[PDB]
Amino acid sequence: ELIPIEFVLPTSQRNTKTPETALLHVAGHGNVEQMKAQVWLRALETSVSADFYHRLGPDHFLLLYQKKGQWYEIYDKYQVVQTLDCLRYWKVLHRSPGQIHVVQRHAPSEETLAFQRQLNALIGYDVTDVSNVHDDELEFTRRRLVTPRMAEVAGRDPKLYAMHPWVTSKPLPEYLLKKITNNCVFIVIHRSTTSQTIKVSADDTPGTILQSFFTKMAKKKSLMDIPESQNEDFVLRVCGRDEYLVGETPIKNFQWVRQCLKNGEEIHLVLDTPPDPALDEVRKEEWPLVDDCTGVTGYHEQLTIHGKDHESVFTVSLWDCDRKFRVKIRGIDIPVLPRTADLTVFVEANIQYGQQVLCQRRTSPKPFTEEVLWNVWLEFSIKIKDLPKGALLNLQIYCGKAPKAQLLYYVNLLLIDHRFLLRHGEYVLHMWQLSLTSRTNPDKENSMSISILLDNYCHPIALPKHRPTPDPEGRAEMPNQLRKQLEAIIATDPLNPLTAEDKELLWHFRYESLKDPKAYPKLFSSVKWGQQEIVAKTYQLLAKREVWDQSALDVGLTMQLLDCNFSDENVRAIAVQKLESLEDDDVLHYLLQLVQAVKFEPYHDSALARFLLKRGLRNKRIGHFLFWFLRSEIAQSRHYQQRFAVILEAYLRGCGTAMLHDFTQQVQVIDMLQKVTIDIKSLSAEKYDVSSQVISQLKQKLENLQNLNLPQSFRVPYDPGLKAGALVIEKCKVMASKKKPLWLEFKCADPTALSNETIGIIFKHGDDLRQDMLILQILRIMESIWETESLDLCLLPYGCISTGDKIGMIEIVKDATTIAKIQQSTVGNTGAFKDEVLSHWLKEKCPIEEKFQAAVERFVYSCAGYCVATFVLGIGDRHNDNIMISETGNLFHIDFGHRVPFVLTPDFLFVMGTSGKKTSLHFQKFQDVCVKAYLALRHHTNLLIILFSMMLMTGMPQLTSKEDIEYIRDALTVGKSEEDAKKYFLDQIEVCRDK
Amino acid sequence: SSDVELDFQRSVQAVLRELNTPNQSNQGMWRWSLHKKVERNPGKSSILVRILLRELEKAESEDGRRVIIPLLLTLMSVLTKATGIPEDLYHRAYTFCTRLLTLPAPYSTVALDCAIRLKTETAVPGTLYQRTVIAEQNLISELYPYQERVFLFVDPELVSASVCSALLLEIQAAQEQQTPEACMRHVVSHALQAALGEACHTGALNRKLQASSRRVLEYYFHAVVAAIEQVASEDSPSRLGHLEKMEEIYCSLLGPLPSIPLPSPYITFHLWTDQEQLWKELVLFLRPSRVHTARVLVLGDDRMLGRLAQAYYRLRKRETKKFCLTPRLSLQLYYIPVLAPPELGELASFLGRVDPWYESTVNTLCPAILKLAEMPVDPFILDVITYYVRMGTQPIYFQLYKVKIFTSLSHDPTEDIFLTELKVKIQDSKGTGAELSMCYQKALLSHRPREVTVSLRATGLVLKAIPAGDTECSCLHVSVTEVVKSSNLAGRSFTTSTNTFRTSSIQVQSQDQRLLTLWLDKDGRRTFRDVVRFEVSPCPEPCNSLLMPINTFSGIIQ
User: Fold this and answer.
1) Which of A14, A107, A655, A981 has the CB geometry, 3.0–4.6 Å to A973, for a possible disulfide?
2) What residue range is the signal peptide (chain B)?
3) A95 vs chain B: nearest CA distance in angstroms?
4) How far is the C-alpha of B56 from the C-alpha of B53, rounded, in Å?
């Protein structure tokens, strides 16, 4: 099929300034590179400006086409011509010939280079550094992410994006409803120095509220400095916070309003002017758009050599290659040998898909010298046509004593690249040392490397796209016994391994399994991905996933399909498609694991990455937290910094000037505080000594920083609603800890703040806060679960965020004191044995008996919540300095670095009004609340297990293997009756009481 | 018909046994005997084809990779000369070739070349024979202007005069029988026969052609070439249209099975006495796809190869200056080892290890060649040379190395090149060894930069560019004979130890006023005396390192 295409050339006819054109009949089965070469030869033959084409090569030019008024680049030089989106578009328009413009590539402007430098500084990584790549996957992903980013930016309302509200659709729990009288709430609206209280319906929208307000204030505009020319030009914002109340959402569904109702606080709002939308306008994209068909090799019918003339073969289908895969190990070398002089070394080559090893071969052992030469072919028991998309050649270097081999080095090589082409030729891979990523060790000067050779072909070999063919086989009635066995298999928790018999059963009855979404992870775990026919059948099944698409969103199940056990692009794609219905609040709840799951993508560009990019570009809060999560992972994981960095570059390129400025100020503040912390650590010789000299030097350095270098204000990384201003230097101190963190207090920069209270930050350097972040996120998730049961357990999940490698910030919970400090302040060290001390402290803080009883009740609820949480999560090191109580009675735990199941001490029992073994009403309530919360979590065991499994791959010291996660399964008594579970937890309570 | 089939099967099995058991005096004779047998009974060629195809298919099923390329090349050699091959056998061979495209290099590359030729021959039978004869015998044709020539170079100091005279006699005896008129007669006969099969009355055809004047013969030659080339150049060639055109020509010739020999290629024999001889001969060949193909075949040992490398380097350097040969001339290089009855056949050994078919066909020619020189007849050597230059099309590329030689540190260096080896010895002072300073970049598998500077006392050093064994990215293997001082109670004893390393470039300088002698490519005529310093590095492309290609049958079998 010769396709007629008209090419608009960069030169113009001598007499008319009209661009020259060349009509060509291009082989649809050719690639873009050959098409470009044919265009160049034709231009050399026909242009009146031949010297132009003699002086410049084709690579200096882009191939562009117009679609719906926009310009798209034909970017991938190896893309098969017939798969170009432009040809499909023109065929739909009955346009023949189509037009392609050959446009000269220009060098980047100095402004673009400066903006790139700014982006690199924000990222902490240079995404333009090609020094450490074996291919162009990074640049390819940069170009592919242009189109979805620009689609999201183009669909974005800048005014709504500037003021995106923090809301939830979840119904109000009964206990909050009881606080609303006659479905009405009181709101205090502030402007300048004046305020007015109004009574509104809990169902009123901010617009209705504004209309009623302006109607009531019509005769009092001048009093609130409202120009007569202005009308209900204004928005409602939270006092002291950058959080807006806009849209058609009922006032009761705003998170701030729910917080005020939960605490019993008045709802204070400011009547502000809306932010300038121009600050959220995005700079014009210099890059042409890239269509979603870029990198598509096409179908088998277009790539197959069967029935085709050799003249029409430019790419060969991978499914036509009926041979065993092989790799030549040339050898290894290392600049510095291991000190052990009598070691043999051998290479183990594995073909891996996800976590499964499909085949394995090894070289013969040879003496471990600075360089070891094998020069041998290892042929695998897998055919090329059966290689799955995402298959990795995992090379491992093992060492043994010269006559248990210890694994020393490893490296991975993706066999089918991002263009769906089988890799070929010579590779020098720099290997990681062992003290799923296809990235190599960046230390090319000192890291161990392996030289390998893959077969060379006359034509590139491409993985074809699967066509959804109707299955003619798509029923033996499943026997009731096998039905019960399948149901039992489906009912097991995610940690339960599938036997071979389970997998064969699941696959045999795959059509029955497809009727239950809960069977999907197990069914897909039974797929033999190293067999092309089974993979094709699996995709035919995925085409018939109507039950999945129509089902309710189970977030746990959907996230399980993104786990490291599932490397298939289509499975992950249907999971992300399901996640596109997830609300922004819940997305914030799961953002950490969503960021981590990107490590399991075979390529930089994926459905999950695009999902994250979209959600960040739609919601400033999500984008803020996404920025910080990605940046921390960039700073910490050399294995994945590139992937996170390219995703972060796309996001930042979509942010607008306001967000970029905020991020710049934040990073600057972090760098300055890091320098100060390093200086302060160098001044203190001993691990705990905070001498008066150290405090004075801290204050002096902070004063100098405030006067010279700190921004006047910045958004707080752990809470973008908070804006910190000037340091309250007199309140700043070094904390007496091994890591010497800085206690910092800033003034609120928002002039609408109702209290002169400071924003307190513990700045930590040399400490990895990702573990604390995970635990606090899980606590917020547990709170949501309990809220579904109308259980307010009054938890206080404070703000915590990692800002880099072992550097981050923690929120200071105000009016809260460690139990150790209370016990010390009342009677010295013996206070640990004084049951009355905590209750006396709480009564001192709450001298009003009604407030004291409310604090005791809040203590009961928060104690129950944290007891259940620390039990289920196995939180250790619970000394009295790692437990705090607020003056309002909230008990909460801090520092999550890690004889009784949980902390329930006699002084806690005394606050509950128990005396010895006598049960109090508050203690009975404690027991009932504990049981209810425990059972509520037991019902969500699968979600919890999945959330921790997805975090196994962060390198956290206390979450390294699945055995760590089995703790949750055992604590929740999976597989027991609900009565047995209730009794077991009550027994744990009594064990804690007795001990 | 069954006895002839069994006889051919036994011959094919003999070739297969020679290939599977690399155990010397009859190596290569089995293939030659098979080719002679088919030449004596051309009407049985189809028989052999079937056998070969079966064996080929068998080899594919049993993963017998060592026999695929030899059998494939034998099949192609037979098909180039055979007439009356049924179309189904051509389709079977083409299908086999297409299936082999799944094999790694070199199998896929050879199979692709064969598939191209087989497709053209299936649609237009006789194309292979006609094109081969026209190109190799320099027959004038406007529609097929390609010309090929074999240039046979021999060093008279390396190969005896008796060998040269015997080879010259065989070549001249073959060329005296290959007159342009005889070749035109062969092309016409072969084309008409290949197209018409049993409908071609071969006897009447031969009588008519022998009785025709030169003008008539030339007319029919041009008509046949025109028909074949016109049908072959069509987008969709049809065997039926080709048959119709050939029937028209045949009827015009005669009005409304003698074996047709495939002539040996035109071979010019040259005693290599001048370093410029090759250049001059190529320029003369070009004097009135590249239209001309020069197949330069050298007979000799490693010294002859060093000379060929020098000539090749000079040719590339000149081409960068006057661009006169490369737009029109495809240069292919071939090597036949003639070793005196083990250090001078290094490259030969290497080739034999990487291409077993080369080992069994070409490397075994040295005794026969020598035997031919002692004799005061089927041209065995000429047949093997013909087969080699026609079927050996897979190049193996060898890195050339440049050496700068300093006799004094104040004078400009003399530059030369080598291919196989650079040997260095310490000159005797008109006391054992000389202190040498060496600076080199160690060749590691990671390509990590590692510069090494060492000073040691040595008696000699050898840089080898060709790997010695299978356990050995083009790098030099350097062996230094170091003098180690051992102080025993009984006095100062000196022992010699050999240290080996690999490097891409190396600089060596004598420190104790003792001078060095260098030998290039083991050639006593390429000796440099009174040398103080030398530097070796990969030879750059005359403006990428310069690589020299030597054609074999299979290239590098991995």
Assistant:
1) A981
2) none
3) 28
4) 5
> Measured between CB atoms, does A316 come within 8 Å of chain B?
yes
Which positions in chain A touch B469 (Cβ < 8 Å)?
A: none
Can you name the residues that pair with B378 across neighbouring β-strands? none
Q: Domains along chain A?
A: 2-104 (3.10.20.90), 174-274 (3.10.20.90), 300-462 (2.60.40.150), 466-560 (1.25.40.70), 659-811 (3.30.1010.10), 816-994 (1.10.1070.11)
User: Would the CB atoms of A323 and B112 count as touching at under 8 Å?
Assistant: no
Pairing label, strands B516-520, A316-317: unpaired
Residue A698 has a CB neighbour count (10 Å cut-off) of 24
Q: Does B103 contact A457 at a Cβ distance shorter than 8 Å?
A: no
Question: Final residue of a domain: which of B82, B97, B125?
Answer: B125
All residues of chain A having their beta carbon less than 8 Å from the beta carbon of residue B447 are 428, 449
- Please indicate if the annotation marks A74 as binding a ligand: no
How many domains would you assign to chain B? Answer: 4
Q: What is the CATH number of the domain that holds B405?
A: 2.60.200.30
- Chain B residues lying within 8 Å of A331, measured CB to CB: 445
Instruction: Tell me whether residue A620 is exposed, middle or buried, using C-beta atoms within 10 angstroms of its C-beta: 0 to 12, 13 to 18, 19 or more.
Output: buried
Residue B554 DSSP SS3: coil
Cβ within 8 Å, pair A323-B473 = no
Give the resolution to one decimal, in Å.
8.5
Residue B429 lies inside a defined structural domain of this protein:
yes
| Determination technique for this entry | X-ray
Residues B23 and B114 in one domain: yes
Neighbours of A724 (CB within 10 A): 27
- In this structure, the answer to whether residues B427 and B530 fall within a common structural domain is yes
Least CB–CB distance from B471: residue in A371, A373, A450: A373
Decide the pairing of beta strands A2-12 and A366-367.
Answer: unpaired
B34 & B96 share domain: yes
CB-CB contact of A749 with A719 (8 Å): no
Distance in angstroms (rounded) separating the CA atoms of residues A416 and B4: 51
> Does a structural domain hold residue B137?
no
Longest dimension (CA), chain B: 107
Cα–Cα dist A852/B200, whole Å: 121
Check whether residue B113 and residue B233 sit in a common domain: no
Strand pairing category for B147-154 and B292-300: parallel
Burial class (CB in 10 A: 0-12, 13-18, 19+), A476: exposed
Q: Are residues B471 and B510 in the same domain?
A: yes
Q: What is the distance in angstroms between the Cα of B443 and the nearest Cα belonging to chain A?
A: 9
Residues B211 and B349 in one domain: no
Measured between beta carbons, which residues in chain A are less than 8 angstroms from residue B119? 310
Q: Is A469 known to sit in a ligand binding site?
A: no
In this structure, the answer to whether residues B375 and B411 fall within a common structural domain is: no
CB contact under 8 A, A305 and B471: no
- B7 lies in some domain: yes
CB under 8 Å to A984, separation ≥6 — which residues?
A973, A976
Helices A641-653 and A137-144: crossing angle, nearest 10°? 30
Residues in chain A with CB shorter than 8 Å from the CB of B558 are: 328, 377
A248 within 8 A of A205, measured Cβ to Cβ: yes
Q: Check whether residue B245 and residue B362 sit in a common domain.
A: no
Spatial CA neighbour of A777 closest among A803, A752, A790, A795: A795
Nearest to B105 among A370, A444, A455 (CB): A455
CA angle A432, A436, A437 (to 5 degrees): 60
Q: Which domain holds residue B73?
A: 1-125
Q: Is A124 annotated as a binding residue?
A: no
The answer to whether B205 and B187 have CB atoms below 8 angstroms apart is no
Strand positions, DSSP E, A596-718: 714-716
Q: Which of A303, A375, A423 to mutate to test the interface with B (most CBs of B within 10 A)?
A: A375
Distance from CA of B112 to the nearest CA of A (A): 9
Is residue B208 included in any domain, yes or no? yes
